[PDB]
Amino acid sequence: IVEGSDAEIGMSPWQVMLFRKSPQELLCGASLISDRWVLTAAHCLLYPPWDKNFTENDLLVRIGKHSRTRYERNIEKISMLEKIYIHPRYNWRENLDRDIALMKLKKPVAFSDYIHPVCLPDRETAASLLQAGYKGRVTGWGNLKEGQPSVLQVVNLPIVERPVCKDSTRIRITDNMFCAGYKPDEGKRGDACEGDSGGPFVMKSPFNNRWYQMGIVSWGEGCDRDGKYGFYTHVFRLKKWIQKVIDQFG
């Protein structure tokens, strides 16, 4: 997270850390969606142009964390994965189209003050919240600049109009992505960066007062570059595939 600040304890109880067994390192961010399900980006697990192919036995899921490095004994909870579900139409070849993945936990995780799931949006929520100018929130332990924080980082970023997203890149944008960040003429800064990937982009509803995950930290050209925006996997558009796998696989 570039140009962000420290998170308060229990500010994102759905934030998950994707952690590699050997070598012991941070892989990605992720989010708790229920007691047995975790949402991430498919690129965290599978990206053939960079030789990335991580299976279930290669990693652990660390929920309830604040510190990046510490083993937070009676706060964090470590889970093994049962199965990884990568969207079948995930496009690693061209543009990271459909950069989404589901992970089933071996055993359910008990909730606490530090472990709680986030809501997935419905049609009502998406229509109300997913508008240009509205702010969302990104969290993670990734790079501070294009450098490693000791504690979870947060940044509030506004949603950008589809034409501005299309104009800022030479990559082919689809309706399964949205972009966020400040325009050069806005003065404010901030972006997600390497290590943040798979992490949630959330909005709080002013109606019910719930937190909804609208996006997944996907791609961007550099970090916090002027005239450049962070691209996020559109959660609502892909919600039909999330329901399919959760309902089919328990």
Partner: peptide, 11 residues
């Protein structure tokens, strides 16, 4: 950099 996690999580 990272602290060692219990060996129960690695087996």
């Amino acid at each position: 950099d990272f602290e060692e996690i219990p060996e129960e999580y690695l087996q």
